Subunit: 146 residues, 2 copies
């Protein structure tokens, strides 16, 4: 229907929002984990809450928040035009969320070797790429509506 | 003019694009610097290009790319409705771009102490916040046009 433009617009609006929230968060989680891993050597110092003192904790919350965000995005059924794009993103998200979930495990148990061996970058890049696509396909939509 | 909707739309389209590119990049630069700082201790190993071996180099390019992006955004005069928002973002960007430029200096000269003392987070958060505003004000625009 004519007036339905807004309901199908705000939907494609929130799909983009929380999606950019997820990325912003996993991107902030990887930096938090590095601040913990970096300081888990010569410049340790802090004894109160050893290991999980400050940034490790902040990196558990940031992933938790990115999980909460995406959970909504996945809750919304993708438009027929965006089905193949949404899936590509979902898959790429699975790998990277997992990668970070394991980096948190690694930092919890002092597994530095494991930490620095996982090729986290490729999985981050794989997700960004899928994101740029979804966005392209997504913006195109409105342009194919004005 | 009536048809001008597209020229004023695509403009507010690219302003948002390259702006999200900048953030994505500084967010990727801080993670690169941590990978370098983290490994600039027990798990060094690599002798080819010591210090500036891999991630330090990648972190110079990512900032360089984020600089290139924003340079465009700043090149575009802000709409009367977005002037006060664009400025708030500019300022907050100045602090954080600088913060990262110095973390690169720190990692180049082995200044680990300086590296872990700068309160990078507050400046990142200060920028994200200003970004959420600009976005709000920016999205509102089209909604105040449909």
């Amino acid at each position: 229907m004519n007036q339905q433009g807004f309901v199908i617009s705000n939907e494609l609006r929130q799909q983009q929002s929380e999606l950019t929230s997820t990325w912003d968060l996993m991107l902030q989680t990887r930096i938090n984990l590095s601040r913990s891993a970096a300081r888990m050597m010569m410049d340790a110092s802090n004894q109160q809450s050893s290991a999980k003192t400050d940034l490790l904790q902040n990196a558990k919350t940031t992933l938790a928040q990115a999980a909460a965000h995406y959970a909504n995005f996945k809750n919304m059924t993708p438009l027929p035009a965006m089905a193949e794009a949404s899936a590509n993103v979902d898959e790429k998200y699975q790998r990277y969320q997992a990668a970070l979930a394991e980096l948190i495990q690694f930092l919890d148990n002092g597994n530095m070797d494991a930490y620095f061996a996982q090729p986290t970058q490729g999985m981050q890049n794989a997700l960004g790429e899928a994101l740029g696509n979804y966005a392209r396909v997504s913006e195109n939509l409105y342009r194919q509506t004005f």
